[PDB]
Design a protein around this ligand. Structure first.
Ligand SMILES: [Ca+2]
Ligand code: NA
Length: 327
């Protein structure tokens, strides 16, 4: 009859939307190999189809939400029954397929455990973090790292309304850094309509339904640094932390870089920290260091958590995205 999609366009007060620098780890490269074997990206316009997890209990493959309710963390569900889904797990060294009869958080967890147990693993996990680094001046620019128009002030419990959106120190740097275990991808619906009773699609008119069609597991951080050191000094120090050796539980970072980060105003949004399924926001280098140091091997019992996801429109199965623009 007709397919309507709503894909947000968000203007940011940045001069550039693309990361200044980035590093891709072997494991993340190999996962994409497995995905492929089996977008506008300019400084002034950037399409984002990856959304960092903000509501862990609702972020499971096959979940269906009103797309206009994601940015404020409401995630209003659309609860009509779904057809069973077919999902593929792309690992660094394997590709595993499963069927989930009734998409739910518990069903995803059970499927993940089964896939982790079945998967072939080759060589040793390197534990290197991927990282993506960008200078910033306004806290709203961190929406880039989250991949969507989230409320940065509420996530980080900071007042950035009005003139407080601007950093107070000389230099601002943020980064997104990840250790990826695997990516789950949902097959397109067999009959073109995710709903078990296809006529329920028409009942979702006006509810802007999107379904979670890809979920990546691992651990993730988004760090914000405000410092009176220079961009090059902060950026070097940040990379030194992210790439430092870990010896008997100690981050073997050079002393000057540690001092820069300790002296800075440093917050990290963490998904997949040890012990918790919740997201955490920490302040200070010590908590950042602890997260890096304890980022260990993935196992079936400790597979990480959902760290980011993609969604698709139920009307036509196209990918849901945010377009970021400058000015
Ligand atoms: Ca159907
Ligand atoms: Na390094």
């Amino acid at each position: 009859n007709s397919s309507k999609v709503l894909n947000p366009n968000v203007t940011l007060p940045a001069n550039n939307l693309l990361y200044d620098e980035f590093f891709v780890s072997k494991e993340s490269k190999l996962i994409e190999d497995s995905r492929n074997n089996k977008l506008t990206t300019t400084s002034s316009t950037l399409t984002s189809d990856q959304i960092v997890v903000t509501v862990p209990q609702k972020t499971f493959i096959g979940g269906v939400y009103n797309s206009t309710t994601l940015d404020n963390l409401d995630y209003t569900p659309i609860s009509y029954p779904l057809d069973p889904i077919t999902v593929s797990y792309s690992f660094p060294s394997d590709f595993i397929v499963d069927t989930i009869e009734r998409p739910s958080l518990s069903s995803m967890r059970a499927s993940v455990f089964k896939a982790m147990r079945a998967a072939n693993f080759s060589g040793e996990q390197s534990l290197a973090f991927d990282y993506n680094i960008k200078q910033f001046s306004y806290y709203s620019e961190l929406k880039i790292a989250f991949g969507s128009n989230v409320n940065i002030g509420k996530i980080f419990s900071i007042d950035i309304s009005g003139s407080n959106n601007k950093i107070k120190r000389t230099t601002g740097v943020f980064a997104k850094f990840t250790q990826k275990n695997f990516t789950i991808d949902m097959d397109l619906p067999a009959d073109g309509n995710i709903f078990k009773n296809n006529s329920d699609l028409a009942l979702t008119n006006g509810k802007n339904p999107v379904y979670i069609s890809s979920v990546t597991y691992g651990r993730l951080g988004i760090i914000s640094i405000e410092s009176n050191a220079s961009y090059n000094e902060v950026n070097f120090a940040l990379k030194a932390a992210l790439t430092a050796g870990i010896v008997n539980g100690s981050l073997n970072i050079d002393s000057n870089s540690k001092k820069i980060l300790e002296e800075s105003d440093l917050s990290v949004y963490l998904v997949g920290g040890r012990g918790t399924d919740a997201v955490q926001v920490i302040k200070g280098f010590a908590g950042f260091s602890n997260f890096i140091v304890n980022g260990g091997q993935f196992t079936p019992e400790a597979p990480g958590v959902p760290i980011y996801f993609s969604a698709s429109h139920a009307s036509d199965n196209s990918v849901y995205y945010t377009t970021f623009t400058i000015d």
